[PDB]
Design a protein around this nucleic acid. Structure first.
Ligand SMILES: [Mg+2]
Ligand SMILES: [Mg+2]
Ligand SMILES: [Mg+2]
Lengths: 101, 127, 117, 197, 94
RNA sequence: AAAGGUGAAAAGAACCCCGGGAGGGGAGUGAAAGAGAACCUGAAACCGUGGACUUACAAGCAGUCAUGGCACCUUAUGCGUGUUAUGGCGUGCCUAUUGAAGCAUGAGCCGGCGACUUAGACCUGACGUGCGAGCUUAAGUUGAAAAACGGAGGCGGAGC
RNA sequence: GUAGGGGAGCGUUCAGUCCGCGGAGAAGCCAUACCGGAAGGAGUGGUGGAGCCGACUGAAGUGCGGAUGCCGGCAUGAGU
């Protein structure tokens, strides 16, 4: 008998580009990671705003959204697909599923 | 030779003219001073120097030397007027740690060091 | 699962502590000082490789003008002669001739004197 | 493209996955399968909170040499395991079609080597086991190969307990892991083996 | 020397930088810049008339060195290996 | 708080020797006592004994390069290995910093412990795979040496 | 070449798979002048006395000189 590599469960390959290795903070000694002061082991300075442009910009607006319709294009019926028929249950089954509107 | 397993059954390990006083309640450096005068000297000189060295390590040391002598004769057949302190050394045993009180509340630890006084007798032989 | 240091550090440490040979005191016995010493040794190592090359040429030149002056010349002059006698392009070896082959060294002094004056 | 063993000789059916099998897709599958099976038990008192210890210590300054809050931090021997494992999952939903493509592609691998379709173990008689070994002997099942039996016969299964051989798998409750895990596939019971969609 | 000899040597198997003529007895001829063959001393182009004959003994890698680099307080530490390739040549010429 | 470990089995060492004892040396048991009750391994700091080469006109970040002397020969005889004299060169490490050998911070030494994680049907991007003008299931349900079912809903699909 | 970004890899524990090894001696420890471009890896010998290497793939409590860091042992001052 001799030493054998063999194919199967052990021959299963990663997939190339499938999944790379994460970032473990020590690629040489010279990793004292983040910034060098004021970037700290704290829970966020935040990322949005309340003057940083958003405030200082206008509107009282008024939001509504009553009824919005499903766009059934003409090109869907025409060009291809011979009249299978509209009705209600057939347009859905062909491709225009949505309900509620 | 054979192998280790075999050797252990074949040759069983002897300590000729060796004796040890283990866990002796005395500091090594303190004991070494005495042992240092006894190294290389003829077992008889050793026995005599010890009776006149005014250090308290003299007694324990002397006791090992007599044991090493006995061992050399009885357990090893060796002849006495040929005997001498081939080797002698003091190794440190486990330290007895004790807590002493000090001024203004603080404490300290006293180390009560122990000794492993081993002496090895051999037959001299000029030739 | 847990993955404690066990064996990895001690091995890492023994490697350093073995480069520490005739290292005086703590420099051969305690890791942090043994390792620390080696950083500075690295400087000396990389530098002394290109330094020996200046060191030797220096020794070489010294022996040349010694012999050059034995035959009423000097390094500056002698070398120019050998340069002026384009044929002569010893440069390397030239010091050993002065030191071991005096008969031969003289010939080259005499040739150098020609190509010049 | 495959024949039969006992009961008939048809087989031939099924458009098996192209090209000459993809390991990458099987890999994606096995991973998911083992990821799902993975229990999420993680014994760790991660928090400085969870470990049993008080809250104040040896004053902010002037004790001379320190700066400590309490005996529960991860820098302390016996403290929390700050960033240790906590109970979790790893179970996710690998797209349906990939699971379907998975075992099909895995079966394809067994066709390119040693595949086996059977119609009933009338060749068995009771459980007996000794008699399963007899039947297996007749079809090149010596014991030099790890074998996977996928039968619906509750008695032919009962004759599978043995070593370097068989793992017995019921009611077409198969796995891409199980088939790749063994050398030969005794696909047997042609219930799932024919007809779908 | 700078590659490719010279001098009045003897029958010595010395080591020099790789020569390309692979395998034993690959035969090499040397320019010659000085000689003491039969005590007669002659230098440059007058020595160029004469030549040295060599036989490629072996191809080898010189004792491993380690290229170590260090810059202080900059966290700069470098470690890399090195082995210099040579060609051993037996001398047996004029 | 910390603290675990003879041996397969107590066969837990009768008897002898030095010692008040402790402790040892034998004898015997055992495969081993290179397991003896301060009983698995037994690193390192640290303390010693012995040997080799060395040092009592010397100025030193303790190395480094070069050469000479002595010693040694089990990846190991041209090859080195150890050590040593003399020469050259040479401002610990980290941090912090315009600027560190700095008489700026930290550190007695060694060993071990000790710091970028995990979550969410979250958002956005690179890679990857499966289907592809379409893609996909959640809670659950049924089987579980195992996965199938489940289309409620979510995303493309028209903007202003 | 500092902060920083990008690439290729070495090592540790656990896991699934395959190939094996082990009381004619496993891991660990100890010595070494060998190999690899580096993390590192092997040979031989010594100790140990019952478990373990290699390859692929997967997952992490995965790599320490620093924190007046924590626990423990041992030094210095000093035979003061
Ligand atoms: Mg705990
Ligand atoms: Mg300050
Ligand atoms: Mg520290």
């Amino acid at each position: 008998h001799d030493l054998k590599p063999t194919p199967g469960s052990r021959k299963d390959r990663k997939r190339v580009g499938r999944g790379p290795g994460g970032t473990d903070k020590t690629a040489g000694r010279g990793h004292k990671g983040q910034k060098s002061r004021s970037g700290a082991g704290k829970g966020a300075f935040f990322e949005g705003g309340r003057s940083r442009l958003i405030a200082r910009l206008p509107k009282r607006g008024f939001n509504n959204v009553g009824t919005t319709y499903e766009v059934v294009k003409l090109s869907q019926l025409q060009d291809l697909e011979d009249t299978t028929f509209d009705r209600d249950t057939l347009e859905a089954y062909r491709l225009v599923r949505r309900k509620n509107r | 030779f054979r192998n280790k397993k075999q050797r252990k059954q074949q040759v069983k390990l002897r300590k000729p003219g060796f004796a040890v006083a283990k866990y002796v309640r005395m500091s090594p450096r303190k004991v070494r001073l005495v042992v240092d005068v006894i190294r290389g000297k003829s077992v008889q000189d050793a026995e005599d120097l010890l009776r006149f060295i005014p250090r308290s390590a003299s007694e324990p040391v002397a006791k090992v030397l007599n044991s090493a002598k006995a061992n050399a004769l009885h357990n090893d057949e060796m002849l006495e007027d040929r005997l001498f302190v081939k080797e002698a050394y003091v190794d440190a045993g486990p330290t007895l740690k004790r807590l002493i009180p000090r001024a203004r509340g603080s404490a300290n630890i006293i180390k009560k060091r122990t000794s492993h006084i081993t002496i090895i007798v051999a037959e001299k032989g000029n030739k | 699962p847990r993955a404690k240091t066990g064996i990895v550090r001690r091995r890492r440490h023994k490697k350093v502590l073995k480069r520490a040979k005739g290292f005086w005191g703590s420099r051969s016995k305690q890791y942090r000082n043994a390792f620390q010493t080696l950083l500075n040794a690295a400087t000396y190592e990389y530098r002394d490789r290109r330094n020996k090359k200046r060191d030797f040429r220096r020794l070489w030149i010294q022996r040349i003008n010694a012999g050059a002056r034995l035959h009423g010349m000097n390094y500056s002059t002698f070398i120019n002669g050998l340069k002026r006698a384009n044929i002569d392009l010893n440069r390397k070896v030239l010091a050993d001739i002065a030191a071991r082959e005096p008969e031969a060294f003289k010939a080259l002094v005499d040739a150098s004197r020609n190509a010049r004056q | 493209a495959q024949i039969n063993v006992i009961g008939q000789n048809g087989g031939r059916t099924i458009e098996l996955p192209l090209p000459e099998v993809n390991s990458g897709v099987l890999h994606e599958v096995v991973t998911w399968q083992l990821a799902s099976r993975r229990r999420g038990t993680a014994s760790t008192r991660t928090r400085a909170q969870v470990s049993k210890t008080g809250r104040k210590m040896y004053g902010q300054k002037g004790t001379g040499n320190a700066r400590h809050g309490d005996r529960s931090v991860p820098t302390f021997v016996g403290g929390g395991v700050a960033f240790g494992p906590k109970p979790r999952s790893y179970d996710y939903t690998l797209p349906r079609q990939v699971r379907q493509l998975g075992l099909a592609m895995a079966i394809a691998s067994r066709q390119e080597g040693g595949k086996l379709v059977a119609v009933d173990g009338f060749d068995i008689a009771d459980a007996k086991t000794k008699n399963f070994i007899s039947w297996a002997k007749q079809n090149g099942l010596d014991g030099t190969e790890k074998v996977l039996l996928v039968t619906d016969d509750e008695n032919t299964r009962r004759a599978a307990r043995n070593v370097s051989w068989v793992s017995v798998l019921p009611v077409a409750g198969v796995n891409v892991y199980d088939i790749l895990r063994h050398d030969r596939l005794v696909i047997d019971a042609a219930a799932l083996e024919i007809v779908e969609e | 020397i700078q590659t490719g000899g010279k001098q009045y040597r003897v029958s010595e198997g010395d080591v020099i930088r790789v020569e390309s003529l692979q395998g034993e007895a690959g035969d090499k001829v040397e320019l010659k810049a000085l000689f003491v063959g039969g005590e007669q001393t002659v230098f440059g182009e007058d020595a160029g008339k004469y030549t040295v004959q060599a036989e490629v003994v072996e191809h080898g890698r010189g004792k491993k060195i380690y290229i170590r680099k260090y810059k202080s307080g900059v966290q700069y530490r470098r470690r890399t290996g090195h082995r210099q390739n040579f060609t051993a040549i037996k001398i047996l010429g004029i």
